[model samples]
Target: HLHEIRVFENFDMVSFEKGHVIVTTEVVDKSLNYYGFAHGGYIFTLCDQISGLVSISTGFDAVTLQSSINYLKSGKLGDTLLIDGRCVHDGRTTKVVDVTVTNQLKQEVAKATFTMFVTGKR
Candidate 1:
């Protein structure tokens, strides 16, 4: 497959059940920003990647159409981040997914909502 699943290598899937997934990743230097906190892209990627998995779990393939995210807290080096994503609305042509990232202490780091357009294929 040309999907290059390794794009998701930054995190490890803890569970991949229907409409729900939990992934974990440690904050390393490469994932940090200039201020030494986790980069926003890293957090957003985690959410985006999980959102895709959530769409697949709904029995359809999808591509992101739109997304909005809110950063709540910062993740530091050595911090383990847990990303959770779920499908909130599954429509005929689209799917809405919600994702949340939390630290090892369960503090919310970021939250995102994604709008996905179904490809009508699995």
Candidate 2:
């Protein structure tokens, strides 16, 4: 294993288990968008990656097939985000996952639903 979990250097993998994962990260200047808030791309990456990891840990070697993200609020620099991801549907051919991000105040900032294609047996 190449520590593939560290897709983003700054994000901390707080906890990981079969079919579930929890991560945390602080918003930084580098992660901000041109408008000065956390970029939706960064948020989506965490969700998408974590979702795949969760599915893989559950005995499905897979890759992200498709993803949909819903941005509800702005995540600003210096804010701490707690991200939790898990497999909502795991099938022979595909896996579906959901990720939810919350701010330090436990406010829901963004959520994502992603699908992955099971390519191998884990």
Candidate 3:
């Protein structure tokens, strides 16, 4: 459990090293939408979080500039979700982050490509 949820308020960080971040959470009832699949909004929030954190791991102040995500499969309730995020590009003024989410069976649930702006200081 991460206390950062008190501030940023989202997924829990499973690991963060170098420019990669891994997070996971259980698919609870509240995370499901009307169709009973995990809500897309929640997935996007968690994906964006990892992208920003992974960008910041490069020691540069970072913020998401743009994001593109796709839901490839439905996430059922009671499933444990795993999110993996990593930096794809690190530029002098920008960074590209890739994030993916999987279900307990390792099924690809979603994927996101995030463009981050490097600014200010480390």
Candidate 4:
């Protein structure tokens, strides 16, 4: 009983090229909330991670400056979630990342936009 839960332990990097990234994960019991739906925090974390990946792919290290997320649908148990992220605006000192989360059925679960400040040095 000494095991600790890691939220991104099962995160799979499907593809990463240029400034776009695709990741996948399953909605397990740990990903759910008391209402049996995927927790909002989990979804937000997925977006944030993908945003970071996008920044890396663009050849820079960055930190999140600000973000806004919109949850459209509930992620149910056993759903396979696909996350896609892209860098829409690549500025010299900052970047704007966009991410979308969808279930196996192609239903959009959540979408987010993140503003990241380039730390200079990857």
Best-fitting candidate, scored by lDDT: 4
* Candidate 2 wrongly placed segments (more than 4 Å): none
Worst 10 residues of 1 by lDDT: 1-10
38-91 in candidate 4: lDDT tens per residue? 988889998988888888888898999999999999999899999999999988
Model 3 agreement with the true structure over 30-88: per-residue lDDT tens digits? 87899999888888888887777777678777777899999999888888889999888
Off-target runs (Cα >4 Å) in candidate 3 are: 1-9
- Candidate 1 residue-wise lDDT, 8-90, digit = tens: 54777788888887888888888878899988888888888888888888888889999999999998999998999999998
lDDT, model 2, position 102: 93
What is every candidate's alpha-carbon RMSD to the true fold? Answer: 2.3, 1.7, 2.1, 4.8
- Write one digit per residue (lDDT tens) for candidate 2, span 42-104: 888878778867886788778888888889889998999998998888788999998999999
Tell me how far the alpha carbon of residue 100 in candidate 1 is from the true structure, in angstroms, after superposition: 0.7
Q: What is the lDDT of residue 12 in candidate 1?
A: 75
Cα error of candidate 3 at position 87, Å: 0.3
Cα lDDT, all candidates: 0.86, 0.84, 0.82, 0.87
TM-score of 3: 0.89
How far residue 61's Cα lies from its native spot in candidate 1, in Å, is 0.9
Report the poorest 10 consecutive residues by lDDT, candidate 4. 1-10
Separately for all candidates shown, the number of backbone clashes (residues 3 or more apart, or on different chains) is: 0, 0, 0, 0
